[PDB]
């Protein structure tokens, strides 16, 4: 019996601010105990100030991102180049994921952007389609090493609402450095995309594997 699935590791993290969103991921693609690539981005700018990242089976994530981008292009064609909201994108991704209910994608999905009011918004998707809006979400085989760090160094009830973008970037960098120290899979780089009303900004940091 041919096995159509696989695993490529990787860790992603999405945080929602008061007027911005952050989506970061480690840029290392690895097979079982071997490094395929030391720089392979997993977070993409999927159109109208929306960042998307599917972690797990790389081929499934690439296919899902490609399908979503084509759907966004046809959405712009159909409705006078109307801007696609984050909740509509979330429902589109839910339908895309559930369309393969009996042959599921082996990915966990996180998207980030700004809602209608202007606050940061992060949506999390299980492989079959179920989604919900969260303030912070960590996916991959480092979440148990990243979430307690964030809970210790910040409160979601220093409240998260008063944080600036630089403080969030610093917290993400520190958590990923700690995970890199503790976890073998995590390392070799960290790419962060910040979504604000001005657009999407990209930053890169080198982790402890070169």
């Amino acid at each position: 019996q041919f096995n159509p699935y696989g695993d490529n590791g990787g860790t992603i993290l999405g945080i929602a601010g008061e007027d911005f969103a952050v989506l970061a991921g480690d840029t290392r693609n690895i097979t079982d105990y071997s490094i395929n690539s030391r720089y392979e981005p997993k977070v993409f700018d999927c159109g109208d100030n929306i960042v998307m990242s599917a972690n797990g089976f790389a081929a499934d994530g690439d296919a899902l991102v490609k399908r979503f981008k084509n759907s966004v292009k046809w959405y712009h064609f159909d409705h006078n180049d109307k801007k696609l909201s984050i909740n509509s994108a979330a429902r589109n991704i839910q339908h895309l994921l559930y369309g393969k209910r009996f042959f599921p994608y082996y990915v966990h999905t996180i998207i980030a952007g700004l809602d209608e009011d202007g606050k940061g918004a992060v949506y999390s998707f299980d492989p079959v389609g179920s989604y919900e809006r969260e303030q912070c979400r960590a996916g991959g085989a480092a979440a148990s090493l990243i979430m307690p760090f964030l809970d210790n160094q910040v409160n979601f009830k220093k409240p998260l609402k008063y944080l600036s973008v630089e403080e969030v970037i610093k917290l993400v960098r520190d958590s990923f450095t700690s995970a890199t120290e503790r976890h073998i899979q995590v390392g070799d780089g960290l790419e962060i995309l910040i979504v604000t009303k001005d657009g999407v900004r990209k930053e890169f940091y080198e982790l402890k594997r070169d």
């Binding site: 041919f2 690539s37 690439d62």
Partner: protein
């Protein structure tokens, strides 16, 4: 299919300051039997693309047929096929990755590992890897099979990161590739002594070398 029957072993590729270099040995093994000698596993597509395929030989020939069909259809009906309307390596890799993923989703995959190497029109090097599951990735050095475990560290010692690409001349990359092929012939049972090499350079074009043999063998440390 369910498993390869006649199989190739490894393809190794590296980036240097002006282009890319790829190499693969000429052998088709029938299980533990080294059956066919003289199997070309590097396919030159266009004047600037080289595709290296490792794995099932029948699927490799099928992919060769697909590449030839693509090249023939490109000239239909472009009168500038040799001109700026040629096939970029990105187009070929996108088509091949789409085919591999579609066949994987159909439960009838092509048991191959494919490395596409070349130089774009603007002069940017292109080097990508795809497999039977449709997993695609890029790196300054790429390899398949036992090359991914033995030749990869040797190549990464030369081109460690993206900043080291402009510092690597073609001579250094070619020497490293030859040494990696020698190591593979040393420590791979299904490997072969004869191999082919391809250099794609934005100035000198495509250089294809055949009937290259592993030399400088060290066996005297026995008795």
């Amino acid at each position: 299919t369910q498993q390869p029957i006649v199989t190739g072993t490894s393809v190794i590729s590296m980036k240097y300051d002006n282009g890319v270099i790829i190499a693969a040995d000429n052998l088709g093994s029938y299980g533990s039997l080294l059956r066919f000698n003289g199997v070309e596993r590097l396919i030159p597509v266009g004047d600037n693309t080289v595709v290296g395929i490792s794995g099932d030989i029948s699927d490799m020939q099928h992919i060769e047929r697909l590449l030839k069909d693509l090249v023939t259809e490109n000239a239909y009906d472009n009168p500038l096929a040799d001109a700026e309307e040629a096939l970029e390596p990105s187009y070929i890799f996108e088509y091949l990755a789409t085919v591999m993923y579609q066949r994987r989703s159909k439960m009838n995959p092509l048991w191959n590992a494919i490395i596409v190497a070349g130089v774009q029109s603007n002069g940017d090097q292109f080097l990508r890897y795809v497999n039977l599951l449709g997993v695609t990735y890029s790196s300054p050095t790429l390899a398949t099979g036992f090359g991914a475990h033995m030749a990869n560290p040797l190549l990464r010692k030369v081109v460690d990161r993206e900043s080291d690409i402009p510092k690597t001349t073609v001579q250094v990359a070619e020497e490293a590739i030859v040494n990696a092929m020698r190591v593979l012939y040393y420590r791979d049972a299904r490997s072969s002594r004869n191999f082919s090499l391809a250099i794609i350079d934005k100035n000198t074009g495509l250089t294809f070398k055949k009937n290259l043999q592993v030399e400088n063998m060290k066996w005297d440390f026995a008795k």
